[PDB]
Symmetry: C3
Amino acid sequence: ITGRPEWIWLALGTALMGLGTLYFLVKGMGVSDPDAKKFYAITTLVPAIAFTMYLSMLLGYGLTMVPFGGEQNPIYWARYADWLFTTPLLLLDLALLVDADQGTILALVGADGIMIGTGLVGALTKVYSYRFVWWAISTAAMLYILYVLFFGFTSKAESMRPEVASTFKVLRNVTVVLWSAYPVVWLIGSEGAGIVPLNIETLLFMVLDVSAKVGFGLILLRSR
Amino acid sequence: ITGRPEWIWLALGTALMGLGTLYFLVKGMGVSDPDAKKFYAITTLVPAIAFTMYLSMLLGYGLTMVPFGGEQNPIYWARYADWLFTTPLLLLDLALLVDADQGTILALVGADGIMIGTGLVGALTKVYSYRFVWWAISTAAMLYILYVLFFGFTSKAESMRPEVASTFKVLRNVTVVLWSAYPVVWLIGSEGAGIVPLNIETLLFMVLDVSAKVGFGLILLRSR
Amino acid sequence: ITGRPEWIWLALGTALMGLGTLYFLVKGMGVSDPDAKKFYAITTLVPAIAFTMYLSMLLGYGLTMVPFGGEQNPIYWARYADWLFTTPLLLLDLALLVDADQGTILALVGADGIMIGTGLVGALTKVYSYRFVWWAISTAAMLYILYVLFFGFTSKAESMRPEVASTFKVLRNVTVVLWSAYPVVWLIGSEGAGIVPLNIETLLFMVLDVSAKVGFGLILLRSR
Ligand SMILES: *C/C=C(C)/C=C/C=C(C)/C=C/C1=C(C)CCCC1(C)C
Ligand SMILES: *C/C=C(C)/C=C/C=C(C)/C=C/C1=C(C)CCCC1(C)C
Ligand SMILES: *C/C=C(C)/C=C/C=C(C)/C=C/C1=C(C)CCCC1(C)C
């Protein structure tokens, strides 16, 4: 509803983000190869930070009251804090893996940058119609990322060790399906056009969350 | 006045930032040399981001009401968001071009960092007299950048290919004149001591804007 | 009390941060070795930025009124702005010195990132009990940094020139004692459980401040 009905999923989300955190920490202990160590460090802040956000979200600090088209709607801007950080870090996990030219890395981060950032302003507009105007400009941002990811990073990927190629594909396909889920979820949800209730919203991004970060966590890190 | 008289220039500014964006995007398509690709990626986020800011500025989100010395004055803090990002990216375009030692790059970004950042606090102070105290400290910041730019980057520049040297000078001279324009513009303007009206302010930074980013865009990117 | 009793220490803190700034600036003038230049640039933004924060803190902008457990308490969020920037830069001074693998650098910055960041949310919670919940999670963050600093960076350090080893130890030991002081100071202080008055708080972080940045300034920079 606005800080009480989904206290559950939230709690559930904190337990999951942080468990995943304690796990990695107690899994990179060994690590000799500095090369892989990178992946580790990265593939760990993500859950950690993710944990801090899902925690303030539960306790309260998370939400805020954005006024749009009639009544006062809930907006865990706390998410965006997270996504603003995680999402880049993730891309790097990808670029870094498939050794991408800094050129594309850079354009890729900034692409994501404008995406999430704008996703925030979207979920912070008072004028009801404008909310979607950013939704638009933002998606355009994502379709960009996914494009120059599923095209390039595929090629370069599939031009080295069989290890990389395959693994890349794993995450790559997941990332695409997973990620894409958002625009819609956001939409049907209370942050955009309120179709489903917050009882849902929370739980949707909740699953997409633990799966994208810890999914991409076990999946990635547990590969050569 | 405060969101209505300059709706024009604003609209005009959005059309220009974004047009420049679509242009680059459809101009880096080819690009084989990863070296130059860097320039591209960079020389593109700038307009893009620039576009997003000038857009929220028009629709509304842009402005805010800062209270100083009597009445309530307008402050498109939205600009600063932009400048906070563009300006560094630009410097990198410069440093990167004239292959500058990370040492100076770093000190240069942070120099700009303190500049824009402080330019914000300046344009956010309630006590009328203090506004200028930051104006001061801030300018000091710029004079720093321009100094260690027009001095160093000139030398190193003029010690390679005739291409670089000349091009550097192009942008370098523009950057200096252009950039400098601000301190004054800001001043005469409503964000500092209100001399000219917002009918102007907007339109001034508007021109200095499209010219600095897209100016530096065509100018730069269209060179070897 | 809340912007008047400690106007002193504050003023004193500004004078010190900025003096240290003018000093470095007029001490890196020479510098031929690009390698060391890095240290310089870094070891300078720190004081500079530090100066800007301690200045807005004195003039006013600094503080804010956070409501927790009864009455309205003061919170120079301005600090956190500072620490959020300085602290990383410092670590880099360390990592960079003892040539640490980017892997650890990265995990180290993000470690600090979550630390300060969370230290803020801590000092921004309304519910009195939660304030300490972040205090906890945050410290955990620091103990992390100090751990993987006093362990690793020691080893790698002590495996090169006698210069480095010794110097590292200097700063390293200082950093540890100094840094640690905070959690407690914060605690006994008004930002956490209000034991001592703001007459103190200010002056404590004031000393720990000028000593950590300018301490680590002269100490570091004045070594081979
Ligand atoms: C851990 C979090 C992850 C992997 C988040 C991914 C998020 C997105 C792809 C979000 C996309 C959005 C839009 C395309 C439109 C505006 C709203 C957003 C930010 C939810
Ligand atoms: C695309 C935007 C560009 C190139 C902006 C450049 C802006 C400046 C050089 C701004 C300077 C300012 C001061 C020197 C004093 C405080 C106010 C500012 C931020 C307008
Ligand atoms: C120039 C500033 C420096 C070196 C600051 C260092 C600050 C810390 C180690 C702060 C630590 C904190 C906690 C461990 C708990 C939450 C409160 C903080 C941010 C004061």
